[PDB]
């Protein structure tokens, strides 16, 4: 049992529907990946949860749907850098989906930590132009997932 990615998101109706109606079926039906996913907190107290540790140990990638709603979780607001260090240590290059429409809403701290850690992470931006099958979003995400 080896999955291609664990997808971490938050219990937001927009985020839930984007994951379940767009991201997950595209990965599963086109690129035919095996995915685990959950809207649990992966870093209670900015330390890996037991569930994260299990899932990392059985998944080849970590995808985080890093919306403004996601970034309202406790570890994001008080120690995003430590959380990011844990994800880098556990998943080598964690993948962060970020929404271009929210880039102004993202705190300066978060944005600076993301840029700071660019060599250790993969940041893929989802914009208005990204849904179309030919978009750069789907190209980069196929490129960073396990090849089939």
Q: What is the DSSP letter of 3?
A: B
Helix locations, 1-148, DSSP H: 13-18, 24-29, 50-58, 74-91, 108-116, 136-144
| Reported resolution, Å | 1.9
What is the domain range of residue 97?
1-148
Q: After which residues does the chain show a gap where C to N exceeds 2.5 Å? A: none
The count of residues in the chain is 148
133-142: which pairs have CB atoms within 8 A and are 24 or more residues apart?
138/26, 141/27, 141/95, 142/31
Method: X-ray
- Compute the CA torsion angle 70, 17, 131, 136 (nearest 10 deg): 40
């Amino acid at each position: 049992k080896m999955y291609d990615a664990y997808i971490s998101y938050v219990n937001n109706e927009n985020d839930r529907k984007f994951v379940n109606f767009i991201l997950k079926p595209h990965l599963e039906n086109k690129y035919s990946h095996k995915l685990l996913l959950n809207d649990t907190n992966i870093l209670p107290g900015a330390e890996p949860s037991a569930e994260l540790l299990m899932n990392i140990s059985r998944c080849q990638r970590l995808i985080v749907v890093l919306s403004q709603s996601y970034l309202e979780q406790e570890w994001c607001t008080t120690n995003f850098r430590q959380g990011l260090w844990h994800l880098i240590e556990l998943s080598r290059k964690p993948i962060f989906i970020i929404f271009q429409s929210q880039q102004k809403q993202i705190s300066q701290d978060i944005s600076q930590q993301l840029r700071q850690h660019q060599p250790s992470i993969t940041m893929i931006t989802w914009g208005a132009h990204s849904m179309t099958p030919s978009s750069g979003f789907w190209k980069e995400l196929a490129l960073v997932m396990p090849r089939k």
